[PDB]
């Protein structure tokens, strides 16, 4: 019991952490100078196998402003639905633009809007879209055809 | 058609051209320029068509 | 106090043209001079440019209201 | 590997595409100019936060984003004090109207204060200094179209009163209506919806 | 210049509103601290 | 730690320095060049790799490609 | 008239950037009397030049000596006496850029007139006054001829 | 026939490079490049070497092609193919990965 | 610890002040952004059985316009709050005209105590926050747009402009962190001011439910 688990130092679920200088302008610190230039700063970031977010944010010397989480469900529980919407679009825009391709913002705004329209995170599956009060003839076309009728 | 105006770079366009001289007069016939719906400069390719 | 767009939507344009072309094909009175053509869509298109389509578009609002727009009233797009 | 991935990619993606369409089939643009669903539940107040279709927009550049607090000033300011430089640009009977009239000079200075405030807005909109933006009308090509249509000859002094621009832009800003209405709640949203293009 | 001076003095008035609000919050804190005392 | 022998202090300092060095992420490789000017920060400190030339600015992290 | 420019030039280089196309080469030149710099593409296939060659280059607005300002369409069948009859190399094109040493206050002393003969670019460059004949989007002819001296 | 020589030279250098990486790891001198095991740093070095090799030989393939070349003309028009397709045809195929 | 609890106590108190300032109440600019040193000098810098003990850094703050509208923000010592602890808390709210409150527990309260919170509800509106949740101001986050709680007079004008039933608006659930920040209740509209990349700004509304 003491060997496996005693948490000598650190927080749980953070299975391991990597320490990175950003190379790109994506995770670089941005600071408007005193002359109006932008001046990308190069600051250390930590990048993680694991999520916890609230025990992380609370740590001293850790930016409680710019500390994002990738797991959209942690974002729903910790930062609330309007942050999910922003973060979900950021995640979904990352998986789209990674390969160099571009999708218009309308469509990304729209899906993230539909998924976050009833307050709870609304999943694009039977456990989400058929629990919505849409009406039976809509629901039965998708999945669960006999059951919802 | 019409009187289009546009500017594009052909795929072989050297990066260090826009800095130096010959900017508006490309040795390689890169830098596509369309004015009044006329092709003035440049080779066309995927980047322009 | 009409609040809707003063422009003829592409969907309105499609079905108004289609609808009027149907009526034309059914021996309706034309509201425009025929310079010697016979296609009901060609006719309908002509009529459309003349703003002479004898049709009003009932646009339903989400609340349940509606606004009626003559064809000659709204701004044709194409 | 490629052959393998092909055969599996076809089966999975086709189901994701289906689920997408079924969770957003009834979403449409009502005559209200609002984005609703089958229940009449409002999704977006304006389509894409901006009220504008997907086909007509283009990539463009914000000019006032990322110059610096001095290159921005000597480029968006319109000094009316340098007497020699305005006879270069403007004709002889416009360089006195801006060198004497204190109304025209307050107007031109007030416009630059508006651009300086728009500049700070831009920098809270677009942190990370990202000039590239998607908008309806390609301004820079329109300008260029204008130069080739009227035969501009950018080497003569122009006859365009620096105030006709300031006031024509104000009157143009009016005609670009997304949210119709005179209500404060409607004016605010009209102002918002057309903020970036403005 | 006069407009700059009048705007500056108006900023001083808002400073003074902070002064009266701060004394006000302090003024009710003496009455309230009695309630934190009797609470326990 | 402060009461330890000078040998044990220097050993701990070396182990701590090695642990820090091992946990430092490898800097992403590529050919450093001044041939490319960054469109965002206008600096010339760039790194390229050819696969199409991919370019990264070492100052602002901006990335772009040439075909 | 309509003689927008004239001088003698010599070929200082035939293609100093290195021959980029097979039938066309970047002549670099300076002028004898007005001391203009010139870059000029020519059909090196139908009209060959070497280094140190001299040619009289007459940039014209029209072809006809009386200056009657032709339209801009091809008509081979024409009796009217032209300027082309005393030249060897004749081309037709648009001045597509004019560029100069303008300051914020004072005027320019030097111009570069850039013209495209249907793709074959030319930059004639030097004294603004000797280049006062050129205006952007005007049509223009080349009219060059090799001097045997 | 000059390009062939350059390629072969590059390739030999590459094969040579990897032997020293193998020697270092075989004699325990390849120190784990921070954020890696031993077996990972090795694989990285190798792939770097080899990728470098492919990139370099690809470049001399492009540089050798006459303006009359027909692969080039379909790559610089963007019609069909990429610069790596010329590399693979003329110079080297490259490293075959699974997963 | 003794030093880390002083740090944590001050952080919580700072976020509570920025909370009650966003809720509309009246907080001095000194109590809003005080630093850790004068937090040491103010109480005792010794929480390990000393002078900055909990239930002494508790705060009462009165509303900005109604100077009789107050709210307590209690601080239990009990990690897991129970009915008799919140019975006393409630017992001495009755001596005054205070109704609203706020329980900053260390560990979670018991599910039986939560009832007493709802049972006491319409007469004394109280709510719980974990000390853990309070360590950060979530409204400061870069993902969180700007939230403005609309007044009853202007919710009707919004639903009246759009000709829109409150049933047809997007939703935000009562337990949402941002909902608990503002202390909004069921049937309450939330304005949201978003920086838009295609428009520049976007204002959207969310109904609490």
Curated annotation (Swiss-Prot), chain E:
Tissues in which the UniProt entry reports expression: Widely expressed.
Q: List the disulfide bonds.
A: none
Q: Which domain of life is it from?
A: Eukaryota
As for subcellular location, the record says:
Nucleus speckle
Q: What does this protein do?
A: Component of the PAF1 complex (PAF1C) which has multiple functions during transcription by RNA polymerase II and is implicated in regulation of development and maintenance of embryonic stem cell pluripotency. PAF1C associates with RNA polymerase II through interaction with POLR2A CTD non-phosphorylated and 'Ser-2'- and 'Ser-5'-phosphorylated forms and is involved in transcriptional elongation, acting both independently and synergistically with TCEA1 and in cooperation with the DSIF complex and HTATSF1. PAF1C is required for transcription of Hox and Wnt target genes.
Assembly, per entry: Component of the PAF1 complex, which consists of CDC73, PAF1, LEO1, CTR9, RTF1 and SKIC8. The PAF1 complex interacts with PHF5A. Interacts with KMT2A/MLL1. Interacts with STAT3. Interacts with SETD5. Interacts with ERCC6.
Q: What is this protein called?
A: RNA polymerase-associated protein CTR9 homolog
Instruction: State the species of origin.
Output: Homo sapiens
From Swiss-Prot, chain F:
Q: Name which cysteines form disulfide bonds.
A: none
UniProt: Zn(2+) binding residues? 38, 41, 57, 60
Gene Ontology cellular component? Answer: nucleolus; nucleoplasm; nucleus; transcription factor TFIID complex
Q: What is its main location?
A: nucleus
Q: Which Gene Ontology MF annotations are present?
A: DNA binding; zinc ion binding
- UniProt-listed GO biological process terms: erythrocyte differentiation; positive regulation of transcription by RNA polymerase II; transcription by RNA polymerase II; transcription elongation by RNA polymerase II
Q: Which disease is it linked to?
A: A chromosomal aberration involving TCEA1 may be a cause of salivary gland pleiomorphic adenomas (PA) [181030]. Pleiomorphic adenomas are the most common benign epithelial tumors of the salivary gland. Translocation t(3;8)(p21;q12) with PLAG1.
The name under which this protein is listed is Transcription elongation factor A protein 1
Q: Which organism is it from?
A: Homo sapiens
């Amino acid at each position: 019991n003491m060997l496996t688990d005693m948490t000598l130092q650190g927080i749980e679920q953070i299975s391991k952490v990597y320490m990175h200088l950003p190379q790109t302008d994506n995770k670089k610190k941005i600071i408007i100078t005193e002359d109006g230039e932008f001046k990308a700063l190069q600051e250390w970031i930590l990048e993680t196998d694991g999520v916890s977010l609230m025990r992380v944010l609370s740590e001293k010397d850790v930016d409680p402003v710019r500390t994002t989480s990738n797991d959209i469900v942690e974002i729903f529980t910790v930062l609330g639905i309007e942050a999910v919407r922003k973060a979900l679009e950021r995640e979904l825009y990352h998986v789209i633009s990674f390969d160099g391709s571009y999708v218009n913002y309308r469509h990304l705004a729209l899906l993230c809007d539909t998924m976050t329209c009833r307050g709870h995170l609304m999943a694009i599956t039977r456990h989400g879209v058929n629990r919505q009060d849409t009406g039976p003839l809509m629901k039965c076309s998708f999945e669960e055809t006999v059951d919802v009728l | 058609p019409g009187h289009i105006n546009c500017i594009r770079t052909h795929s072989t366009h050297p990066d260090d051209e826009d800095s130096g001289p010959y900017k508006h007069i490309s040795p390689g016939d890169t830098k596509v320029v369309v004015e009044n719906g006329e092709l003035i400069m440049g080779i066309l390719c995927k980047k322009s068509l | 106090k009409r609040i809707t767009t003063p422009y003829m939507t592409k969907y309105e344009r499609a079905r108004v043209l289609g609808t009027r072309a149907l009526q034309i094909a059914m021996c309706a009175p034309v509201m425009v001079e025929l310079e010697g053509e016979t296609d009901p869509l060609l006719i309908a298109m002509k009529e459309l440019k003349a703003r002479k389509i004898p049709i009003i578009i009932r646009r339903y609002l989400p609340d349940g209201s509606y606004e009626d727009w003559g064809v000659d009233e709204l701004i044709i797009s194409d | 590997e490629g052959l393998i991935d092909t055969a599996v990619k076809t089966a999975e993606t086709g189901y994701i595409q289906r689920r997408l369409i079924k969770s957003m089939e009834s979403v449409m643009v009502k005559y209200d100019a609002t984005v609703r669903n089958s229940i009449n539940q409002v999704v977006q107040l304006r389509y894409g936060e901006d009220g504008l279709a997907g086909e007509s927009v283009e990539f463009q550049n914000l000019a006032t984003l990322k110059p610096s607090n001095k290159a921005f000033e000597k480029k968006f300011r319109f000094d009316y004090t340098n007497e020699r430089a305005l006879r270069r640009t403007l004709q002889e009977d416009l360089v006195k109207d801006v060198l004497s009239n204190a109304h025209i000079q307050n107007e031109l200075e007030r416009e630059f204060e508006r651009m300086r405030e728009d500049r700070e807005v831009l920098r809270v909109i677009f942190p990370t200094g990202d000039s590239k933006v998607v908008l309806p009308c390609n301004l820079l090509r329109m300008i260029w179209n204008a130069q080739k249509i009227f035969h501009i000859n950018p080497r003569l002094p122009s006859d365009l009163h620096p105030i006709k621009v300031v006031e024509g832009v104000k009157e143009l800003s009016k005609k670009l209506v997304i949210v119709n209405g005179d209500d404060p709640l409607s004016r605010q949203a009209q102002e918002n919806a057309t903020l970036l293009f403005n | 210049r006069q407009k700059l001076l009048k705007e500056q003095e108006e900023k001083r008035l808002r400073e003074k509103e902070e002064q009266k609000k701060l004394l006000e919050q302090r003024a009710q804190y003496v009455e309230k601290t009695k309630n934190i005392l009797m609470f326990t | 730690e402060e009461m330890a022998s000078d040998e044990l202090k220097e050993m701990r300092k070396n182990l701590t320095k090695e642990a820090i060095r091992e946990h430092q992420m490898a800097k992403t490789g590529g050919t450093q060049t001044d041939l490319f000017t960054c469109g965002k920060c206008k600096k010339k400190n760039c790194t390229y790799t050819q696969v199409t030339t991919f370019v990264v600015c070492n100052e602002c992290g901006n990335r772009w490609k040439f075909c | 008239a309509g003689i927008l420019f004239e001088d003698i030039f010599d070929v200082k280089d035939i293609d100093p950037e290195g021959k980029k196309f097979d039938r066309v080469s970047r002549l670099h030149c300076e002028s004898e009397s007005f001391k203009m710099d010139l870059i000029l593409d020519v059909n090196i296939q139908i009209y060959p030049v070497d280094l140190g060659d001299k040619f009289r280059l007459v940039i014209a607005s029209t072809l006809y000596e009386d200056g009657t300002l032709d339209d801009g369409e091809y008509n081979p069948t024409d009796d009217r006496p032209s300027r082309a009859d005393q030249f060897e190399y004749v081309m037709y094109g648009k001045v597509y850029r004019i560029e100069g040493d303008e300051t914020s206050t004072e005027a320019a002393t030097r111009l570069s007139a850039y013209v495209s003969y249907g793709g074959l670019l030319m930059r004639l460059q030097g004294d603004a006054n000797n280049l006062h004949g050129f205006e952007v989007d005007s049509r223009v002819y080349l009219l060059m001829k090799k001097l045997a001296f | 026939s000059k390009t062939y020589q350059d390629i072969q030279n590059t390739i030999k250098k590459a094969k040579q490079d990897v032997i020293e990486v193998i020697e270092k790891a075989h004699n325990n001198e390849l120190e784990p490049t921070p954020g890696n095991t031993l077996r990972q740093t090795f694989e990285n070095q190798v792939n770097r070497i080899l990728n470098d090799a492919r990139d370099k030989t690809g470049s001399s393939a492009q540089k050798s092609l006459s303006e009359y070349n027909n692969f080039k003309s379909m790559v610089v028009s963007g019609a069909k193919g990429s610069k790596i397709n010329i590399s693979q045809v003329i110079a080297v195929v490259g490293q075959q990965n699974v997963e | 610890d003794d030093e880390e609890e002083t740090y944590r106590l001050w952080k919580i108190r700072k976020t509570i002040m920025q909370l009650c300032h966003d809720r509309g109440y009246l907080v001095t600019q000194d109590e809003l952004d005080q630093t850790l040193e004068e937090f040491k000098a103010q109480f005792g810098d010794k929480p390990s059985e000393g002078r900055p003990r909990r239930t002494d850094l508790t705060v009462l703050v009165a509303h900005n316009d109604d100077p009789t509208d107050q709210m307590f923000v209690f601080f239990p010592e009990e990690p897991k709050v129970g009915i008799k602890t919140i019975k006393v808390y409630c017992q001495r709210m009755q001596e005054e005209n205070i109704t609203r409150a706020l329980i900053v527990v260390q560990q979670g309260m018991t599910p039986s105590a939560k009832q007493s919170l709802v049972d006491m509800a319409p007469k004394y509106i109280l709510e719980q926050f974990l000390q853990q949740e309070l360590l950060i101001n979530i409204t400061e986050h870069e993902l969180v747009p700007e939230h403005v709680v609309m007044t009853k007079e202007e919710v009707t004008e919004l639903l009246a402009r759009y000709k829109l039933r409150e049933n047809q608006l997007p939703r935000i659930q009562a337990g949402d962190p941002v909902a608990r920040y503002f202390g909004i209740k069921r049937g309450q509209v939330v304005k949201i001011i978003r920086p838009s990349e295609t428009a520049g700004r976007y204002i959207t509304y969310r109904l609490v439910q």
